[model samples]
Each structure stands twice: as structure tokens, then as C-alpha cells.
Target: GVAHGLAWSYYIGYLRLILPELQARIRTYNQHYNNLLRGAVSQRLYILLPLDCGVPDNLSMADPNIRFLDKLPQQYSNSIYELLENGQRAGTCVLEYATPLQTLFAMSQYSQAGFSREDRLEQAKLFCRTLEDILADAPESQNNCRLIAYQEPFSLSQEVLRHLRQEEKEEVLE
Candidate 1:
């Protein structure tokens, strides 16, 4: 019932690699992004935090609520700005910014509408473009701040790499 959650700081370097494998698994299962099927399982798009990016040492370790620094709403801008300014003072260049579970609900909503494959592709492209904009506007991004998104099957506990390798080994044996 608790949707409020924190991103795990542990193994984020490794977690970044997990994104691509999930994407590959989806490609193997669906053959293409446009014709995705629900057969594999109910999946959610997980948007990773940019916490690993060069945050200034001056910035507080306490969680900052806003997801996007540059694109924050007026009410949030002040706090985000203050945080960014705090970072900027330390001579840091890179900075950054989802709910993975709540988003699946929106994804399924589109499916419920029976969107055509072409329409779905259009929707998917639009979603990708939107994310691109977010990454582009990040302060001093230059690849320092990045967005990593991947489809994850609903589960209580996820051992991402192990699951991927298990399937990979089976694929090789077969």
C-alpha cells in the first residue's frame, strides 16, 4: 500500500547495467518495441535516480523531493534551486533527477484503450522524446547526469542480474 519509496543507493553502478539486459529480454520476447505483449508478465518501467551523478559535497544527504531540478514547479523550484546552488558553490558541474509502480498503471491504461500497434509506437516514441528532453535540460549534464529506464516484472524481491544470466545460460544451452 505504500507507494512512497526511496531508491537504493547500494550497487547503483551495477544497477545501471541491469537496464540494458531488461531491454534485451523485452526485445527477445516481443521481437520489437511496437508489438509488445503482456505474455511475459506485468512489467513496469523503472526510472533510476541521478544520485550517482556528480552531486556537490555541500548538498545535503537528506532526500530532495523533486525529480527534475530544472523542470521543477514554482513551489518546488526554490528548494531545488537552493539545492543546486548549494552544489554549484562546491564547483560541481553535474546534477540530476519517478514512480516505477504507479507508472505501470498508466501504461496499462493505454492497453485498455486497445491502441493500434502503430498508435502504440507513436505513443512510445513520444514517451522516449519526453525523457530525452529531461536529460537534455539537466545542468552541465555532458553525460554526467543520465536517465536509465527498464522494464521490470512485478516481484517482491528482484535479483536482476542473476535472473538475466539464468535465462541467458538457458538460451545458450538450448
Candidate 2:
């Protein structure tokens, strides 16, 4: 139930980062974006918003719905964009549209597939590998660029899973 009902806003920023146009749209109407995310979480939807809105500033705490922005390290922004681009290229139209309903539906379908954890971990690994390959081909960038990419995958694959599992275990123990 938890997995199937998970919200999409948790992953929407990635879409925002990738599509500069969408990011601009988001900045232009941040309040609307925040409300949209809040509505999705409230409604238990997981639709992802589009990233092509336009170029906006990187995530900032000025937007309450996007507190997660502050948590994102300064680096890895490009990697995040790359991942969103990858999803778009893969034809995830909901992600392309940045619709909370569609994202939720897609996530629910994935959850029902019984390999959600494995799928997420695999995606994290692939993202990390892709970022590594990108960074390797271009050497003049900051080190955090590479570190951020690698760290994201590790966090998603190991840290997030562990934290979630621990939370579940604690709930059970309680």
C-alpha cells in the first residue's frame, strides 16, 4: 500500500532540473507549482511535472513545497537533468508532461510489478554509471560534479532503501 501510494513530487525536481524551459515556468509560477505538488501529495497522486518549462534558478528554500531543493547538493544538477532527459527519451510521457496524476499512475504500476525496489536501485546504478561516463569524457569540471552524481546513486540505492527499511522496521517494532 505504501509503495503503490507513494507520491511523485519526491522525484519531480529531477524533471524540473533537466528541462530548462519547464524550470523557467516553475520559477514564473512557483506558488502554483508548490500548490500542485501539495495537491498531489494530498491526493496521493504521483504525477511528475514537465522540465521544459524554461530555465529557472536551481532549487531554493524560498519555495516551501520545494524544501527538498535546499537538501540537494549544489552539484549533480546536470546529472539530474540527464536522468530526466533519459526518461523523456524513453517515452515516459507523464514525466514529459509533468502531470502528478500520470506520475502517480506510472509509479503505482511499477510498484505492483513487485520489483519496485530492484527497479529503483537499478535506475540509481544506471544514473550513476551514466554520470560517471559523462564526467570521464569531460575533465575540466569541478570534482563535486562527479561526486554528486556518484553520491546520488549511492543514496538512492543504499541510503534511501536502508532508511525506508529502517523506518518500516521501527514502525513494526513500535
Candidate 3:
């Protein structure tokens, strides 16, 4: 129970850490892309995580503004609606990345192979499209719900795991 508690606390903190930077990047993206987002605010963060540290299965939350998606739907345009339909919720999601940037940088095995310049460029384009498509339908209403997506490092999850393991060890000691 404490492990799960630790993971959730870590997640909440990590979200706070990256959110401002993520918003600034989205603003920059809009500037470059003809104000695609216009006056919309980013309320939901679709965090693309690696498969190794996928969405926590037993995790549950009272936060209505967050969600976890098992797979990205095929149609980009309908992504937002699909998410809404799936969860009756939004705010944050853990979807898999098209190309997790952290893996490209952290894995020495891929230092010279597999991850080519073209691949990176293509993935960036894909990520941009996905972000745009998901946020496209977000309402800029008085209720004010918007969407943005990001790829976080796997080490974030690893750190949470480390804490959970530490808790377990402490339990054993007790």
C-alpha cells in the first residue's frame, strides 16, 4: 500500500515539475504552427511513457483530470473523444511514445545504430501531429479544458520504483 502511495505522490510531484516547461513548449509550438491552439489552455497532459514503465495497473485516483490509456487509437482526429469515452475523465494520461527521447539519449547500445536523424525527425513530426490532433477538440469554454502531450524519461518511473523497493525493505526490517 505504501508503495502505491509513494508512486502516486511521486507522480503528482513530477507532474508539477514538468508542467510549466511543457506549457511553454506548447506556446512555442503554436507560435511556429500558425497559432494552431489559438487561445486554448492546456489542461490535460498526455504523457507518453516507455513500455518498460507503462501506466501503473493497480493505480486509481480521485483526480478527475487524469487518465491512463492502454493504446493510442488509430485515428488521430478522434483521439480526444476516444479518451473521453474510455475514461469519462481527463487531465493526464500515460500513453507510449512514438520515440521516447530519453531512451535515445540514455541507451549506449543505440548510440550509433537504429536511432537515425531521419527517425528522430519523423518521430517529432508524428508527436506534433498527435499533440495537435488530441488538443484540436479541447474546449476553451468557461469550464476550460485543454490538452497537451509530452514524453517523459523512464528514469522518473525508475526512481519511483526505487522508493517502493525501499519501502518494502523497510517493511521487511520491521
Candidate 4:
């Protein structure tokens, strides 16, 4: 019943990623998804902060968080920005995402709408595009951190990338 939740912080929650914009987008996505399903599940999106991305080369073991960080060697990570730059050189978006559970949820909606199995599969063709686009092209995205939407690219109809680019170009000259 509690929607007022806090983003997890590695620093005993001393650190936080607080952005009203993120919350706004969360509401938009949640609305789009739930409406698409026609009242199937009341899905809520909450931010789960990823582990510490980096530590200065001289980070001391005495640091308060290091004790916990040491146990999860893999949680401490490199800059996602570094990975994005490398991926750009490859002309590919290194992305990570899964629609496994959402598929089940979505299919329920489809089923209620009388869509057959074949129909549901066909609808999924472009279903993940929005998600793919957001993470794949976001400023500091990296590939597959702890899994689930690390760098998933919402498919573009062309190399145009962002959906807004498509809309802006579509407008006829005045």
C-alpha cells in the first residue's frame, strides 16, 4: 500500500538518486503499460539503484561502504560512460533488457482482448521499442549491470534513433 518508497543506497542509503523527472517518466510508462493491458495489473515502477559505479583509485578500505562492497566484488563497477563511447565506435548499441515477465502480463491483456497466440507474438514485434530506445541511448548507460534493462534499445524504424526526431522531421515546412 506504500508508494512512498526510497531508492536504495549503497551508502546505507546515505546516497540517493532523487529526481522528480524520473518519477514523472515512471508514471508515464506505468500508465502506458497498464492502459495497454486494460486494467490487468497495477504495475508500479520504482528505481532500484545500481551498485557503486566507481571508486577513486585511492579509495581506502577504511571507507564506510568498502566493507560491504568488498564482499560483492562485482558490484563495484566502471563508468557506463566508458562503455557507451566504446559501443559508439562499433556502430552498435550495447544493450541489456528482458521482457519475459512483462510478456506474460501483456499477453493476459491480449488474451482478454481475444488475441490469439499468433496475434500476441506479432504485437510484440515493436512492443519493446520505447524501452529499448530509452536505455540504449541514455547519457550514462552501460551493458547488463545486474541484468534487466541495462542498455536495451527500443527499436527504431530507421537509424533516426529517437522518436522525437521522427516527429520533428514529419512536420511539413510552413
TM-scores for all predictions: 0.23, 0.24, 0.25, 0.24
Per-residue lDDT of 169 in model 3: 65
Q: How accurate locally is residue 77 in candidate 2, as Cα lDDT from 0 to 100?
A: 28
Clash counts for all predictions? 0, 19, 3, 6
Rank by lDDT, descending? 3, 1, 2, 4
Query: What is the Cα-based TM-score of model 3?
Result: 0.25
Better of 1 and 2 by TM-score: 2
Please report, as a residue range, the 10-residue window in candidate 4 with the lowest summed lDDT: 1-10
Tens digits of per-residue lDDT, candidate 3, 83-168, equal: 23234422212222323334333332466556654554444445445434433443332112222233454233333224334434
Q: Rate the local accuracy (lDDT) of all candidates.
A: 0.31, 0.29, 0.34, 0.26
| Comparison by lDDT, 2 against 4, better one | 2
List residue ranges in candidate 3 displaced over 4 A: 35-43, 47-174
Better of 2 and 3 by TM-score: 3
Q: Highest lDDT: which candidate?
A: 3
lDDT of 4 by residue, 72-133 (tens): 01211211100112223211111112223244335436656665544534333333333344
TM-score of 2: 0.24
* Residue 149's lDDT in candidate 2: 22
Q: In model 1, which runs have C-alpha deviations exceeding 4 angstroms?
A: 1-46, 49-97, 110-125, 140-144, 150-174
